[PDB]
């Protein structure tokens, strides 16, 4: 029945998959999904993806603890660049284990909630939700901007494979309304798809 509002809170919890040991996780709750309020979006410390978990319902979660810690509010370093980067196609430079350069095409989706200096981004070749402090990358020349309802509905993604994935559209990107977030039943990532 009763639940506290945990958006903006730091949490820690255990996680158990199958027959493995419980593993320990610490993160920040970014959002509670309006079309499915059981579903929270979480950024875990040291992991780049944004995850969707039904924190209070998922039997894989244990020992859920809400900390009193307050996430610090910083003002972003360049409001203009921050605002105008939203919705843009980008080339985002990474380097890999061998130390060689590795450029990924992506799209900046939104400022992250809660963690004020972070941005939601997704990639052509890895279309799940990521979060980074992209102004840092931009300043270093590692992020270049390229020149240029369904929400709440149950959908499925069909393959030539023959099987399909079932999920729900959970968000429409304000800056790019043809783009949506999807939560699939079998998966804790948040998928990003252009549905027009």
């Amino acid at each position: 029945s009763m639940r506290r509002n945990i958006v903006g809170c730091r949490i820690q919890h255990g996680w158990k998959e199958g027959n493995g040991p419980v593993t320990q996780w610490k993160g920040t709750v970014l959002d509670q999904v309006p079309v499915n309020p059981s579903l929270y979006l979480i950024k875990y410390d040291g992991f780049d993806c944004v995850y969707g978990l039904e924190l209070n319902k998922d039997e894989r979660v244990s020992a859920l603890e809400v900390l009193p810690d307050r996430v610090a509010t910083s003002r972003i370093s360049d409001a203009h660049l921050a605002d105008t980067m939203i919705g843009k196609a980008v080339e985002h430079m990474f380097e890999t284990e061998d130390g060689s350069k590795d450029e990924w095409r992506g799209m900046v989706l939104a400022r992250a909630p809660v963690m004020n200096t972070w941005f939601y981004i997704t990639y052509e070749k890895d279309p799940v939700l990521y979060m980074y402090q992209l102004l840092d990358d931009y300043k270093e020349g590692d992020l270049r901007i390229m020149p240029d309802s369904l929400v709440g509905k149950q959908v499925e993604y069909a393959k030539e494979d023959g099987s399909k994935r079932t999920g729900m559209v959970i968000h429409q990107v304000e800056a790019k309304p043809s783009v949506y977030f999807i939560k699939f039943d079998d998966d804790f990532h948040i998928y990003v798809y252009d549905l027009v």
């Binding site: 992991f47 990474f94 380097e95 890999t96 284990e97 350069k101 590795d102 980074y132 990358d137 590692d142």
Partner: peptide
């Protein structure tokens, strides 16, 4: 540049 994290699963 940032390092890309190892793919999970």
């Amino acid at each position: 540049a940032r390092t890309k994290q190892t793919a999970r699963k």
